[PDB]
Amino acid sequence: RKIQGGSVVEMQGDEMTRIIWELIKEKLILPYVELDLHSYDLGIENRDATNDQVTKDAAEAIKKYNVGVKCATITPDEKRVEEFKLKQMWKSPNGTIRNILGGTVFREAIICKNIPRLVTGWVKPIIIGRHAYGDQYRATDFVVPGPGKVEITYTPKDGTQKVTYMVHDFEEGGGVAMGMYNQDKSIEDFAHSSFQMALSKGWPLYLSTKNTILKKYDGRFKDIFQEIYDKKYKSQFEAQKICYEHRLIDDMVAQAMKSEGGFIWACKNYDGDVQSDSVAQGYGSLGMMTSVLICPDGKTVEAEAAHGTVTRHYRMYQKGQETSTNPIASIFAWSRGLAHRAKLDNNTELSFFAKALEDVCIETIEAGFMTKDLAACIKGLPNVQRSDYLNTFEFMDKLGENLKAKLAQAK
Amino acid sequence: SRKIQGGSVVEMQGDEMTRIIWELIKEKLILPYVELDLHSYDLGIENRDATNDQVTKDAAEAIKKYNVGVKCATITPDEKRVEEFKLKQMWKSPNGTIRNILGGTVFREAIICKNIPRLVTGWVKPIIIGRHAYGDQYRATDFVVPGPGKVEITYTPKDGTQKVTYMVHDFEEGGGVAMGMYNQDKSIEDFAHSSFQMALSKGWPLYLSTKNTILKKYDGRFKDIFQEIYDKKYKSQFEAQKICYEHRLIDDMVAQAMKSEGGFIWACKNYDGDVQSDSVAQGYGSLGMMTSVLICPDGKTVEAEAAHGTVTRHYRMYQKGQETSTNPIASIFAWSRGLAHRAKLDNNTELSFFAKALEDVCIETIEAGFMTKDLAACIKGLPNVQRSDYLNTFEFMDKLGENLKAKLAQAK
Ligand SMILES: NC(=O)c1ccc[n+]([C@@H]2O[C@H](COP(=O)([O-])OP(=O)(O)OC[C@H]3O[C@@H](n4cnc5c(N)ncnc54)[C@H](OP(=O)(O)O)[C@@H]3O)[C@@H](O)[C@H]2O)c1
Ligand SMILES: NC(=O)c1ccc[n+]([C@@H]2O[C@H](COP(=O)([O-])OP(=O)(O)OC[C@H]3O[C@@H](n4cnc5c(N)ncnc54)[C@H](OP(=O)(O)O)[C@@H]3O)[C@@H](O)[C@H]2O)c1
Ligand SMILES: O=C([O-])CC(=O)C(=O)O
Ligand SMILES: O=C([O-])CC(=O)C(=O)O
Ligand SMILES: O=C([O-])CC(=O)C(=O)O
Ligand SMILES: O=C([O-])CC(=O)C(=O)O
Numbered sequence: 158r159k160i161q162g163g164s165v166v167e168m169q170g171d172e173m174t175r176i177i178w179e180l181i182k183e184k185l186i187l188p189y190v191e192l193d194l195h196s197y198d199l200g201i202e203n204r205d206a207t208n209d210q211v212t213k214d215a216a217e218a219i220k221k222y223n224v225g226v227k228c229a230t231i232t233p234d235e236k237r238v239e240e241f242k243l244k245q246m247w248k249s250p251n252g253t254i255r256n257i258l259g260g261t262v263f264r265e266a267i268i269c270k271n272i273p274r275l276v277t278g279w280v281k282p283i284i285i286g287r288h289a290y291g292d293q294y295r296a297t298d299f300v301v302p303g304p305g306k307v308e309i310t311y312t313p314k315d316g317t318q319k320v321t322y323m324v325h326d327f328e329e330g331g332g333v334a335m336g337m338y339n340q341d342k343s344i345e346d347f348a349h350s351s352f353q354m355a356l357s358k359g360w361p362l363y364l365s366t367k368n369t370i371l372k373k374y375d376g377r378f379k380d381i382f383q384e385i386y387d388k389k390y391k392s393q394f395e396a397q398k399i400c401y402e403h404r405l406i407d408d409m410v411a412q413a414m415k416s417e418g419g420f421i422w423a424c425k426n427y428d429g430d431v432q433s434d435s436v437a438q439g440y441g442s443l444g445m446m447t448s449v450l451i452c453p454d455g456k457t458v459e460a461e462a463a464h465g466t467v468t469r470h471y472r473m474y475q476k477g478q479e480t481s482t483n484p485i486a487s488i489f490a491w492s493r494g495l496a497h498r499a500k501l502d503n504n505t506e507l508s509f510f511a512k513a514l515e516d517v518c519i520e521t522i523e524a525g526f527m528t529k530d531l532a533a534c535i536k537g538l539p540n541v542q543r544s545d546y547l548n549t550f551e552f553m554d555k556l557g558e559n560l561k562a563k564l565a566q567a568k
Numbered sequence: 569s570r571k572i573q574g575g576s577v578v579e580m581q582g583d584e585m586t587r588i589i590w591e592l593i594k595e596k597l598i599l600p601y602v603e604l605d606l607h608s609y610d611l612g613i614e615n616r617d618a619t620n621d622q623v624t625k626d627a628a629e630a631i632k633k634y635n636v637g638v639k640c641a642t643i644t645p646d647e648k649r650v651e652e653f654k655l656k657q658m659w660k661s662p663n664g665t666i667r668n669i670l671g672g673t674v675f676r677e678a679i680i681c682k683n684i685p686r687l688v689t690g691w692v693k694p695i696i697i698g699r700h701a702y703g704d705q706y707r708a709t710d711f712v713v714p715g716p717g718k719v720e721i722t723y724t725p726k727d728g729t730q731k732v733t734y735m736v737h738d739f740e741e742g743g744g745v746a747m748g749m750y751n752q753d754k755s756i757e758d759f760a761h762s763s764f765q766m767a768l769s770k771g772w773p774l775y776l777s778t779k780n781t782i783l784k785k786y787d788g789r790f791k792d793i794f795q796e797i798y799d800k801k802y803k804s805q806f807e808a809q810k811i812c813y814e815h816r817l818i819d820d821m822v823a824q825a826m827k828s829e830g831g832f833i834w835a836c837k838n839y840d841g842d843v844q845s846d847s848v849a850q851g852y853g854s855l856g857m858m859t860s861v862l863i864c865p866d867g868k869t870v871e872a873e874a875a876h877g878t879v880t881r882h883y884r885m886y887q888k889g890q891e892t893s894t895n896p897i898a899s900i901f902a903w904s905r906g907l908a909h910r911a912k913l914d915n916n917t918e919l920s921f922f923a924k925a926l927e928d929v930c931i932e933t934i935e936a937g938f939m940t941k942d943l944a945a946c947i948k949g950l951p952n953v954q955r956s957d958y959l960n961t962f963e964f965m966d967k968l969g970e971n972l973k974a975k976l977a978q979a980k
Contacts, residue, residue, distance in 0.1 A: 303726070307748065309719065314739075330752065336747065411850035431843075
């Protein structure tokens with residue numbers, strides 16, 4: 158009999174990750190777990206067919222059932238419009254979901270003992286807490302077609318006192334302009350999540366901004382964090398002998414690069430996006446990172462891989478050429494979602510299954526069976542032979558066999 | 569004098585630890601050997617406050633006139649700096665002010681010594697960042713939103729046609745923050761040309777990073793302008809030199825850079841060039857070992873600087889009587905790169921030799937085992953560094969001065 162899993166929102170995606178997602182459900186999930194599975198096809202063609210309504214529906218379902226697991230998706234630009242004959246240049250589904258749910262996206266490498274890093278000093282984990290709301294990911298941007306003025310205006314709801322600011326007077330030619338924003342409550346929730354995560358690990362917490370340049374916008378982040386620290390967390394931090402520090406982002410990225418790891422890094426949305434990929438690659442691979450959106454309600458989570466649809470590998474797949482795409486991040490999307498589902502429901506067998514799934518992945522790699530990205534960590538990319546790694550499908554097969562044995566040996 | 573006649577140079581003095589080092593460089597490495605028509609602007613925080621920041625604008629105009637500026641790191645004030653110095657205003661970054669006036673691309677690259685281990689194992693070839701020097705976050709209009717209300721952004725055509733208004737956000741609960749930022753077509757085009765030309769001159773591929781999937785209009789403009797200029801002007805030359813141009817999304821690009829062997833030009837939007845130049849500098853060894861030169865679109869005007877800041881934390885150690893070991897190399901290369909460009913403009917052979925000899929002295933000294941503590945930590949690991957492994961700030965300047973004097977004396 159299969160494990161009774163409960164309610165989980167599943168979002169399918171695009172290109173190489175869509176194929177991997179199918180293999181994960183077929184070989185690793187469905188043979189062992191029966192789920193109340195609420196599935197939403199966020200493939201690009203279905204998003205286009207539904208005028209992106211399928212994306213909004215999925216987000217509302219995550220809010221209802223409190224657990225979502227999402228496959229990487231195409232965010233379309235002009236080249237994608239021509240490729241898929243799109244009606245519109247749809248917004249990122251991740252930006253849409255995060256805008257609705259809010260919260261902090263926590264990202265952390267998945268570590269194997271036999272995988273050398275590219276950054277020599279990182280012997281302890283770096284955990285990025287990426288603010289999931291606003292800034293560049295909910296911006297209003299446009300092409301300035303020629304000479305003219307761009308202004309930004311604030312009108313208070315108690316229609317008494319409006320302010321207009323000059324952004325730029327385009328005297329010659331055109332260019333681009335944009336407005337973006339963030340909300341106090343969202344920044345407050347982001348602070349609370351970062352302080353709580355640091356206390357949960359017993360590690361120092363660092364916030365990065367560029368408040369010397371964006372004195373008002375980034376100053377608000379720095380001020381809210383410091384206020385919340387002083388009033389709610391300072392004594393707990395002092396009790397655990399850990400600290401909280403604000404740093405300018407350019408200092409911070411260099412400090413992280415030379416650190417030993419073992420800190421929480423609170424990142425504004427954009428910095429969290431960019432630096433999580435830098436950090437993932439520094440440890441090993443984009444295929445070896447977890448990403449979990451923890452919503453401010455302390456109950457709803459959305460788990461995903463940090464990487465994209467791996468288009469470049471997909472193009473090799475389309476030509477029949479052998480590919481070796483790392484599926485572990487996609488697998489930990491499922492394992493982290495199912496683990497949270499089990500924690501909500503006190504589902505003992507599902508908790509065991511989710512941890513066993515993660516253990517199989519680590520054990521398999523550490524025994525010497527891995528995809529090409531990890532073989533390249535060990536040997537160096539010029540020295541990688543075909544005999545050093547498994548292709549995507551061989552590796553999925555090896556994981557399937559090792560999970561079968563683990564679950565059988567457990568019964 | 570019998571010194572090298574070096575010509576006209578705009579000098580911009582700065583703050584905290586770099587101000588101390590800056591004077592040591594002039595006193596020990598420059599002025600004993602080079603006679604300069606020095607146009608000095610004190611961009612220390614106190615003189616900027618006293619002149620209501622006018623000294624900063626005057627300095628930028630002087631760089632325009634004399635085509636060469638060398639700049640010390642400066643404090644950009646926030647609330648805490650206003651309190652520390654009782655400033656009249658939260659002045660804007662002098663770097664932003666100068667760059668907004670001059671425009672161009674800031675090219676940044678590590679300074680490599682053969683005995684200094686990297687933190688990033690793969691980087692055996694140079695990574696050159698071309699940072700767009702204009703616009704975006706560094707000439708933004710940002711403000712606090714004090715409570716519920718609407719933020720909108722409007723474009724008013726100069727030709728009288730219909731104004732366009734877009735909603736930014738309806739704040740329905742509480743306040744927050746909002747901002748507008750922009751960039752200009754001509755500046756983006758100049759940024760493209762500079763990046764393509766740098767790639768061809770070094771003979772390396774070029775990569776532009778944006779987030780055009782998200783900022784489809786704003787960043788799509790960068791991508792489209794680069795691609796059109798590539799197709800119309802540079803693609804044939806790239807193909808002849810066996811190199812390529814590619815646009816990549818920024819999160820892919822930073823991971824690609826991490827695992828690369830190096831050997832590429834990286835065209836960065838203003839903010840990314842700021843942040844990633846610090847990450848790259850540290851990856852090769854130290855923030856003290858990176859050059860930074862703003863190359864203006866006129867192909868004649870340059871401003872050289874270090875990429876790091878005023879090193880406040882070391883300055884605080886100096887103020888309390890604690891020994892410091894701050895790396896001056898980036899500050900020295902600001903002078904050497906500025907003087908080298910002055911020499912190129914003037915066909916000044918002796919000055920060109922002096923500027924190269926100055927850089928060689930820095931590299932030879934470190935490779936001979938004389939270095940500041942950051943570089944000793946590269947070799948031994950910070951926990952294993954002993955006092956005998958390095959020289960303090962002043963000792964290292966003295967050793968460079970000794971080695972420069974010896975090199976120039978042998979050269980005659
Ligand atoms: N969360 C999301 O849904 C998400 C995130 C990012 C991007 N995207 C979307 O994904 C599409 C492609 O974006 P992109 O090419 O910039 O980013 P990407 O899909 O993350 O791939 C970039 C490169 O990273 C390496 N990589 C990423 N994941 C890997 C894995 N699982 N195994 C092995 N290598 C991996 C590969 O490098 P090599 O080529 O060197 O092998 C790959 O070509 C775009 O349409 C974008 O909008 C979606
Ligand atoms: N171009 C510019 O004018 C510029 C650029 C950046 C910042 N700033 C300004 O500089 C001030 C301080 O900013 P910050 O502390 O964020 O950045 P910073 O001055 O670059 O220093 C940050 C840290 O980097 C290391 N570092 C930087 N330069 C070094 C050198 N020459 N030798 C050895 N180590 C070096 C030190 O790390 P450890 O503490 O670990 O030793 C230092 O504390 C601020 O007022 C800021 O506005 C100016
Ligand atoms: O923000 C992310 O995590 C990935 C992204 O930019 C997109 O969804 O296109
Ligand atoms: O951009 C403008 O038209 C004026 C302004 O705010 C600036 O000099 O940054
Ligand atoms: O932009 C730079 O090169 C350094 C910076 O942010 C500042 O001047 O405060
Ligand atoms: O923010 C608003 O009020 C409407 C809008 O532009 C969005 O939903 O991003």
